[PDB]
Write a protein that holds these residues in place. Structure first.
Motif, PDB file in Angstrom:
ATOM      1  N   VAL E  51       0.839  -1.192   0.000  1.00  0.00           N
ATOM      2  CA  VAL E  51       0.000   0.000   0.000  1.00  0.00           C
ATOM      3  C   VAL E  51       0.877   1.246   0.000  1.00  0.00           C
ATOM      4  CG1 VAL E  51      -0.238  -0.356   2.479  1.00  0.00           C
ATOM      5  CG2 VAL E  51      -1.669   1.323   1.323  1.00  0.00           C
ATOM      6  N   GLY E  52       0.678   2.106  -0.996  1.00  0.00           N
ATOM      7  CA  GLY E  52       1.376   3.367  -1.091  1.00  0.00           C
ATOM      8  C   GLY E  52       2.644   3.349  -1.915  1.00  0.00           C
ATOM      9  N   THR E  62      10.531   3.899  -8.435  1.00  0.00           N
ATOM     10  CA  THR E  62       9.614   3.665  -7.329  1.00  0.00           C
ATOM     11  C   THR E  62       9.142   5.002  -6.784  1.00  0.00           C
ATOM     12  OG1 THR E  62      10.696   1.579  -6.754  1.00  0.00           O
ATOM     13  CG2 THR E  62       9.317   2.598  -5.088  1.00  0.00           C
ATOM     14  N   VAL E  63       7.832   5.133  -6.595  1.00  0.00           N
ATOM     15  CA  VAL E  63       7.212   6.372  -6.146  1.00  0.00           C
ATOM     16  C   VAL E  63       6.310   6.071  -4.958  1.00  0.00           C
ATOM     17  CG1 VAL E  63       6.004   8.450  -6.894  1.00  0.00           C
ATOM     18  CG2 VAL E  63       7.214   7.087  -8.551  1.00  0.00           C
ATOM     19  N   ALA E  64       6.195   7.039  -4.056  1.00  0.00           N
ATOM     20  CA  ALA E  64       5.241   6.970  -2.959  1.00  0.00           C
ATOM     21  C   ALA E  64       3.968   7.699  -3.372  1.00  0.00           C
ATOM     22  CB  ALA E  64       5.827   7.585  -1.692  1.00  0.00           C
ATOM     23  N   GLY E  65       2.853   6.978  -3.415  1.00  0.00           N
ATOM     24  CA  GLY E  65       1.600   7.521  -3.883  1.00  0.00           C
ATOM     25  C   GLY E  65       0.465   7.218  -2.923  1.00  0.00           C
ATOM     26  N   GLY E  66      -0.737   7.125  -3.488  1.00  0.00           N
ATOM     27  CA  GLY E  66      -1.916   6.839  -2.703  1.00  0.00           C
ATOM     28  C   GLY E  66      -2.098   5.360  -2.437  1.00  0.00           C
ATOM     29  N   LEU E  70      -2.476   6.011  -7.969  1.00  0.00           N
ATOM     30  CA  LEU E  70      -1.116   6.543  -7.991  1.00  0.00           C
ATOM     31  C   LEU E  70      -1.057   7.953  -7.420  1.00  0.00           C
ATOM     32  CD1 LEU E  70       1.844   6.562  -8.716  1.00  0.00           C
ATOM     33  CD2 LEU E  70       1.227   7.076 -11.065  1.00  0.00           C
ATOM     34  N   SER E  71      -2.012   8.803  -7.780  1.00  0.00           N
ATOM     35  CA  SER E  71      -2.042  10.178  -7.305  1.00  0.00           C
ATOM     36  C   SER E  71      -3.417  10.486  -6.737  1.00  0.00           C
ATOM     37  CB  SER E  71      -1.702  11.154  -8.432  1.00  0.00           C
ATOM     38  OG  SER E  71      -1.158  12.355  -7.918  1.00  0.00           O
ATOM     39  N   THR E  72      -3.447  11.009  -5.535  1.00  0.00           N
ATOM     40  CA  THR E  72      -4.723  11.401  -4.961  1.00  0.00           C
ATOM     41  C   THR E  72      -5.126  12.786  -5.457  1.00  0.00           C
ATOM     42  OG1 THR E  72      -3.609  12.304  -3.013  1.00  0.00           O
ATOM     43  CG2 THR E  72      -4.345  10.016  -2.914  1.00  0.00           C
ATOM     44  N   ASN E  75      -3.345  15.661  -3.751  1.00  0.00           N
ATOM     45  CA  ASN E  75      -1.931  15.890  -4.029  1.00  0.00           C
ATOM     46  C   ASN E  75      -1.738  16.910  -5.143  1.00  0.00           C
ATOM     47  OD1 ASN E  75       0.869  15.422  -3.671  1.00  0.00           O
ATOM     48  ND2 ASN E  75       0.870  13.986  -5.392  1.00  0.00           N
ATOM     49  N   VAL E  78      -2.032  20.536  -3.994  1.00  0.00           N
ATOM     50  CA  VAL E  78      -0.904  20.922  -3.149  1.00  0.00           C
ATOM     51  C   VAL E  78       0.325  21.207  -3.999  1.00  0.00           C
ATOM     52  CG1 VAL E  78       0.603  20.172  -1.283  1.00  0.00           C
ATOM     53  CG2 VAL E  78      -1.828  19.673  -1.187  1.00  0.00           C
TER      54      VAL E  78
END
Ligand SMILES: [K+]
Ligand SMILES: [K+]
Ligand SMILES: [K+]
Ligand SMILES: [K+]
Ligand SMILES: [K+]
Ligand SMILES: [Mg+2]
Ligand SMILES: [Mg+2]
Ligand SMILES: [Mg+2]
Ligand SMILES: [Mg+2]
Ligand SMILES: [Mg+2]
Ligand SMILES: [Mg+2]
Ligand SMILES: [Mg+2]
Ligand SMILES: [Mg+2]
Ligand SMILES: [Mg+2]
Ligand SMILES: [Mg+2]
Ligand SMILES: [Mg+2]
Ligand SMILES: [Mg+2]
Ligand SMILES: [Mg+2]
Ligand SMILES: [Mg+2]
Ligand SMILES: [Mg+2]
Ligand SMILES: [Mg+2]
Ligand SMILES: [Mg+2]
Ligand SMILES: [Mg+2]
Ligand SMILES: [Mg+2]
Ligand SMILES: [Mg+2]
Ligand SMILES: [Mg+2]
Ligand SMILES: [Mg+2]
Ligand SMILES: [Mg+2]
Ligand SMILES: [Mg+2]
Ligand SMILES: [Mg+2]
Ligand SMILES: [Mg+2]
Ligand SMILES: [Mg+2]
Ligand SMILES: [Mg+2]
Ligand SMILES: [Mg+2]
Ligand code: NA
Ligand code: NA
Ligand code: NA
Ligand code: NA
Ligand SMILES: [Zn+2]
Lengths: 122, 52, 116, 52, 89, 77, 53
Positions: E51-52, E62-66, E70-72, E75, E78
Motif C-alpha cells: 500500500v502506497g 519507485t514512487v510513494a503515492g496513494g 497513484l495520485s490522490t 496531491n 498541493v
RNA sequence: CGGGGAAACCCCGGUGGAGGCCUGUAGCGAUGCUGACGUGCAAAUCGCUCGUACGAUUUGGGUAUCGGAGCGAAAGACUC
RNA sequence: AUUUCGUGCCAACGGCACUCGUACACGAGUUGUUCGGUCACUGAGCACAACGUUACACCGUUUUGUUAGGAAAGUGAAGGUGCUCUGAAAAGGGGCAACAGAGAACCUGGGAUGAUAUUCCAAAAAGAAUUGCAUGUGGGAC
RNA sequence: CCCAACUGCAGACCGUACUCAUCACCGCAUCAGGUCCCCAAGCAUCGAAUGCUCUGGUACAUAGAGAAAGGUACACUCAGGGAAGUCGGCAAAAUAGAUGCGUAAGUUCGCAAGAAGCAUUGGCUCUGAGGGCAAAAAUUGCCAACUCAGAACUGCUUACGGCGGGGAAUCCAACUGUAUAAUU
RNA sequence: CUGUGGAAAUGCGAAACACUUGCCAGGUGACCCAUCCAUCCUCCCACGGUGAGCUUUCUUUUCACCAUAAUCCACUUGGGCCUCUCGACUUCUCGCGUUACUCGGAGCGGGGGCUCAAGAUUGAAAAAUGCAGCUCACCCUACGUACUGUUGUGAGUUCGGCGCAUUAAAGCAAAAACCUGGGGUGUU
C-alpha cells in the motif's frame, strides 16, 4: 502402435532377418548317445521332432531354405539367416525331453557360445 | 507447423503473423485444417499476382 | 522399489538437508547430501540487483580458494558494477564538472563588466 | 503495522569520511533518485525540510 | 460482459457480504490493479507493490503515492499551491 | 588421479623419489602403468604392445615393480 | 582423564614401541579402553609375550 | 479470434485458473443411536453414523504472563 | 538406561502354557583430522557489573544502536633507532540462549563381528581423496 | 623476508550398544487410550478411497467339545398392507458412478442447481478421427501413445467394491469460524 | 614493457596481476505460491544372455538378475549483454514470443560474437570391484584352485528454470565468516 492390430492376424508375425547371415546353433548329445539312454531311434526322433516343431513366421512345419535342421555326429545343427533367440532352442529341447521320460536324468547347459551340451544328473 | 513453413519460405512474415493469431483464437481444429487453409491462401494470392 | 534411510545424524527435510539418491557399484541405493548453492555476485540492490557477467556463483569455501579472475573483470569497478553503470559515472563526472567551470567564468566576466 | 511508506535517504557525514543513512516518513510524490535539501537556505519544494 | 452481467471482478465472492459493500470495494479494487501512466518514461506501466508504493515496469522507478491510486486528488492541488508560492518569492 | 601425457614426463616421474611402486596392468589392446606417488596416482597408457614392453623393461631396478592380477579372497586372507 | 597424545607417549616409555594409531572409547562402566596399533617394524605378539599373556 | 453497429457500444466461441467456494482421503473434531461397556480394554474407552478439510488451518522445539492472581472469539471455561 | 550378544538355566514372574523370554545366572560388546556437539554466529529472550530503591536484596533498569552523572579502549597508522622510542585513528562494560535457523574438509568395496562401523582394513594399506598447522630441499623474487 | 609446485611429520575433547511402541516412553501393568521426523512396489479405478498380491514381517492375544432359553454384532432375509407404531419415521430401508437431453418459485443477478425428471451402460468382431522423425516434397519411408466417436453379431439370473434420497412451508441466527477436557 | 590481449561484450595464472584487519563502499550469507517444462531416482514397456518354473493340450512363453561412489581433466537448452544491418509501425493499421495474464527508437527482428546456469560427450579412478553360473573339471578338507556372462515422443518424481517472486489495510529475519572494488603502498 503405429497401426491398430486385429484379432484375425494373431497367429502371424514377421520374423526379421539378419544382415551378414549364416548363423548356426548347435546342440551336443554325445554323452547320452555314448550311453544307452539315447538310442539311434531317439536321435532320429530328436532330429525329426525339431523338423516339425520349429516355428517360422508364426507357423510350424513350414520351414524351408531358411532354416536347416541337419544332424551330424550326434550334434544337431540349425543353420539360418533368420533372426532367432538362443533360448528358443533350449525351450524346445525341454519340451522334447518332457514328452519323453529322460527329463529327470539329462540336464542341458550352455557349454560355450552358440552351443548347448547335454549331460547327466548326480 | 507455422515456424517450419516460415523457415522454408513457403509463407512470408505477413501471412505468418495473421495465422499465428488465428491459431491462438481457436480457428483450426487440427493440422489438416491448417494446411488446407494455407493452400487456399497460396492459391488466391497466385491468381491475383498473375492478373496484376 | 528399495527404500532408503538418512545416513548422517540429521533427520529433517529442511532447505539445507537436501539429498539425492545414488546407486553404488555394489548395487545399493543410498542417500548422498547435495550442498547448498550461492546466488552469485549481484549489482547493488538500489541499482536494480542484477546478476553480474563474468563471475561465477561460489559458496564460502570455494570462493576463498578460487583464483581472483573467476570473480572479477579487468575494467574499473570490476566485480561491483556493470558496464552501463560505469559509463554513467564517467559521463556524469565530466559533464557536471564542465558545467561548474562554465558558471565560474560567467560570474567573473559579469563582475568585470560591472566594474566598467 | 504502518500505513504510510518510509524513505531511505543517504547523506554525507559533516565531519568524517563516511556515509550516514536516515529513515523518514515519505511524503506523496517522493521518488527514487530525488534530491532532498534540509536547512535554513533550502528552497521551497516538495520533500525539503525547512524551519517553520 | 459476456461471462458476467454486472458483478465484474467481485464475482469471486459468490453470494456473500452484501451487494452494496461489494460495489463500494469494486471501484477501489479496479484502480488498485490497473496500469497507470508514468510521467518519467511515458509508458502506462505503474503498478502497486504494497500500500502506497508504486513501481514502473519500464524505467524501474519507485514512487510513494496513494493507497489505491497513484495520485490522490488532494496531491495535485498541493503541488500547484507550492509551485505558485515558491515562484512568488 | 592424474594422467601422464608423454614419455618424457613419465621418465621424470619415475626418476622422482617417493615413487613407492609401479603397477603394470595388461588390458586387452592397451597397457597401463600406474605410478603410486604421494597424494596422487599417475597413469600412462600405451596403445601398442610393442614400445610398451620396452618401456617396462627399461625401468630402473631400484623402482619396485608389480604386475596387476586378480586376487582371490584367500589370497587376500 | 587421559587423552590420546599422553597415552601414545606413555606406551613408548613403558614398552619401547612405536605406534601409528590410537583409538579410545569410554566403557558403560566408566573405564576408558584404548586400541593401540604398532608399526610394522614391531611385533604385537612379541610384545604381548614379553609382558606375559 | 470472429460477428453486429453511424456511433456509443453490444453478442458468440475459446483461453485463464479466482474463492475465509462445493464433493471427498490423511489430519483436526465430536451430531445421533439417548448403540456397546458401565466391579470396563479405559478414574471418559469402543462401533457405525456424522462437522470441516488453502485457511480466523494443523503441528515440533524454544521463549514470555500466575494465586484475590494469570489467561480467556466469554462456558465462571482452563491454570499437571 | 544394559532391555543388546553368547552360554547355562525353570524356584518366583510373562492373570492359560513353556523346554520359550525384554525372567534368573555368568561372562562379553559401543574404535572418527572429515558424522553430531564444541572450538566459532545471531533470534524471541535472560540477567552479572554499574546505579537507584527497600527496616531488610531474596527488588527495579539492562537492543527503539545497546550499561552506568558516565574517567570501563592496555589496541597501535605513518615515523626514528638497532637487527627498539614517539604517537594518528577507533563513542556506547562482561556473558549466556538453536543437537530442525546460520556454519560444516570423505567416498565406495570387504571373507572386517556372536554383538560396532561413511569410526575397523598396513605395503599391491581394497583403495581413491579433501583439508589445519609447522618444517627442509629444488626454483622465482627481497 | 614473500611466494609457486612438491615433499616430511603431526592432526586435541565428548557422544556412538539397544528401543522408539497392540511388550522397551506416559497412563499403579507387557492397559483396544496418547506420542514429532524421513523412505513407500504391482493390478482394478478419477484414486494415498476401497479390494487382492511379489519383497520385508507375522500365525502373538487362554483353549477343546458343541444347534437350550435370553443376549451382543463394525450379520442377513421375509407373503399381503405400507407409519395404522411412537412424544417424535428413533432405527432400518432407500438414492447413488459416468454420458446425452432437460431443469421451478425466489434473488443482493453471484446463485438457487447434482434443483426436479427421462434414457443408455455387458461381451465379441470390425471402421474412422486425433502425431513425430528422415530424406532431391498436397510425395515416399520408418515409428510411438491411448483417448474419443460409430457398426454388425450375440447375451442377462439387473449380479464385486465404492458412491447424494427428494420436494412445499413456518421460527431463529446474515454467512466461514469459536465454544461448557468428563451429561448442554 | 613494468601486469597484459580485444573496436566492444570481456579474455589471459608456476612463483610481482605483490600488500591493504590504517580507511571507505558494495556483494554472498539471505529467505515468496501456483501453473508449465522437468533432475537424481522409481515403475512400465522394447532388445537378449545366464539360471530356474510349467509342459495330457497350448505358450518364438512366465519369473529373477543384468551395477559404477567421491575427486579430477577436455556439443545442446534457457537467461543476460556486445557489434553490424549507414537500425523497425514511411504507408487505414508492424513484428518477435508463451499453455498462460506482454514486449519493442529509453532500440523489435536477422547474421556473427561475449558470458552465466543446467546438462550431454570424452578420459584418469575402474575392473584389479560387484553380481550370477559351472563347481560327478580337478582337486581333497583346503572360506582351494580354473573358466563363462555382464529403446523409448512412455507414466511418476520440486534439484533447477525462479525473481524487485502469492492473496495482501498480510509484502516474507539477523549476525559471524567470506568475496570484490575505490583510494593508498609497492616493481622499472
Ligand atoms: K479450482
Ligand atoms: K458435508
Ligand atoms: K507375504
Ligand atoms: K430449493
Ligand atoms: K469451511
Ligand atoms: Mg538464482
Ligand atoms: Mg548527516
Ligand atoms: Mg570417540
Ligand atoms: Mg466442504
Ligand atoms: Mg448410551
Ligand atoms: Mg474426515
Ligand atoms: Mg452462569
Ligand atoms: Mg501363567
Ligand atoms: Mg537381568
Ligand atoms: Mg535480543
Ligand atoms: Mg543446522
Ligand atoms: Mg562435523
Ligand atoms: Mg545392530
Ligand atoms: Mg546403532
Ligand atoms: Mg498400548
Ligand atoms: Mg484402466
Ligand atoms: Mg488407505
Ligand atoms: Mg490404494
Ligand atoms: Mg484377552
Ligand atoms: Mg413384508
Ligand atoms: Mg412383497
Ligand atoms: Mg400415529
Ligand atoms: Mg397409537
Ligand atoms: Mg436416521
Ligand atoms: Mg427462473
Ligand atoms: Mg441428476
Ligand atoms: Mg450461525
Ligand atoms: Mg458452521
Ligand atoms: Mg460436555
Ligand atoms: Na472451503
Ligand atoms: Na551461543
Ligand atoms: Na519409528
Ligand atoms: Na499384546
Ligand atoms: Zn516509467
Amino acid at each position: 502402435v503405429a497401426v491398430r492390430a486385429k484379432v484375425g492376424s494373431r497367429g502371424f508375425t514377421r520374423q526379421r532377418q539378419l544382415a551378414k547371415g549364416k548363423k548356426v546353433f548347435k546342440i551336443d548329445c554325445s554323452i547320452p548317445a555314448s550311453d544307452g539312454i539315447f538310442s539311434d531311434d531317439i536321435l532320429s526322433n530328436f532330429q525329426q521332432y525339431f523338423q516339425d516343431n520349429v516355428k517360422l513366421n508364426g507357423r510350424k512345419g513350414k520351414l524351408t531354405s531358411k532354416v536347416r535342421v541337419n544332424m551330424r555326429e550326434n550334434t544337431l545343427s540349425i543353420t539360418t539367416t533368420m533372426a532367432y533367440r538362443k533360448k528358443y532352442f533350449k525351450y524346445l529341447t525341454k519340451k522334447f525331453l518332457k514328452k519323453k521320460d529322460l527329463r529327470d536324468w539329462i540336464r542341458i547347459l550352455a557349454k560355450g557360445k552358440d552351443t548347448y551340451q547335454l549331460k547327466y544328473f548326480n | 507447423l507455422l515456424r517450419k513453413y516460415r523457415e522454408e519460405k513457403k509463407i512470408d512474415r505477413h501471412i505468418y503473423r495473421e495465422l499465428y493469431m488465428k491459431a491462438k483464437g481457436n480457428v483450426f481444429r487440427n493440422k489438416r485444417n491448417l494446411m488446407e487453409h494455407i493452400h487456399k491462401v497460396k492459391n488466391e494470392k497466385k491468381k491475383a499476382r498473375q492478373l496484376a | 522399489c528399495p527404500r532408503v534411510q538418512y545416513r548422517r545424524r540429521m533427520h529433517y527435510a529442511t532447505r539445507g538437508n537436501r539429498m539425492r539418491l545414488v546407486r553404488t557399484p555394489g548395487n545399493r541405493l543410498v542417500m548422498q547430501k547435495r550442498g547448498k548453492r550461492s546466488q552469485g555476485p549481484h549489482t547493488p540492490w538500489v541499482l536494480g540487483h542484477k546478476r553480474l557477467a563474468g563471475t561465477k556463483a561460489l559458496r564460502h569455501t570455494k570462493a576463498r580458494l578460487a583464483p581472483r579472475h573467476q570473480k572479477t573483470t579487468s575494467r574499473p569497478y570490476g566485480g561491483v558494477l556493470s558496464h552501463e553503470q560505469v559509463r554513467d559515472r564517467i559521463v556524469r563526472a565530466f559533464l557536471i564538472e564542465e558545467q561548474r567551470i562554465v558558471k565560474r567564468a560567467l560570474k567573473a566576466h559579469a563582475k568585470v563588466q560591472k566594474e566598467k | 503495522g504502518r500505513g504510510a511508506p518510509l524513505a531511505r535517504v543517504e547523506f554525507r557525514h559533516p565531519y568524517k569520511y563516511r556515509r550516514v543513512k536516515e529513515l523518514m516518513v515519505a511524503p506523496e510524490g517522493m521518488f527514487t533518485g530525488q534530491s532532498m535539501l534540509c536547512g535554513v537556505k533550502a528552497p521551497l519544494a516538495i520533500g525539503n525540510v525547512l524551519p517553520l | 460482459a459476456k461471462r458476467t452481467v454486472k458483478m465484474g471482478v467481485m464475482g469471486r465472492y459468490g453470494a456473500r457480504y452484501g451487494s452494496n459493500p461489494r460495489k463500494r470495494a469494486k471501484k477501489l479494487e479496479v484502480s488498485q490493479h490497473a496500469k497507470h501512466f508514468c510521467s518519467f518514461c511515458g509508458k502506462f506501466a505503474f503498478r502497486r507493490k504494497a500500500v502506497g508504493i508504486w513501481r514502473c515496469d519500464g524505467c524501474s522507478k519507485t514512487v510513494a503515492g496513494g493507497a489505491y491510486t497513484l495520485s490522490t486528488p488532494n496531491n495535485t492541488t498541493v503541488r500547484s499551491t507550492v509551485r505558485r508560492l515558491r515562484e512568488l518569492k | 588421479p592424474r594422467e601422464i601425457k608423454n614419455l618424457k614426463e613419465f621418465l621424470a616421474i619415475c626418476s622422482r623419489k617417493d615413487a613407492r611402486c609401479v603397477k603394470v596392468k595388461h588390458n586387452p589392446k592397451v597397457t597401463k602403468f600406474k605410478v603410486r606417488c604421494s597424494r596422487h596416482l599417475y597413469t600412462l597408457v600405451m596403445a601398442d604392445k610393442k614400445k610398451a614392453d620396452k618401456i617396462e623393461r627399461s625401468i630402473h631396478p631400484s623402482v619396485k615393480k608389480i604386475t596387476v592380477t586378480s586376487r582371490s579372497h584367500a589370497n587376500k586372507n | 582423564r587421559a587423552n590420546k597424545t599422553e597415552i601414545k607417549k606413555a606406551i613408548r616409555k613403558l614398552y619401547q614401541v612405536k605406534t601409528v594409531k590410537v583409538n579410545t572409547l569410554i566403557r558403560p562402566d566408566g573405564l576408558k579402553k584404548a586400541y593401540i596399533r604398532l608399526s610394522a617394524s614391531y611385533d604385537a605378539l612379541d610384545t604381548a609375550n614379553k609382558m606375559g599373556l
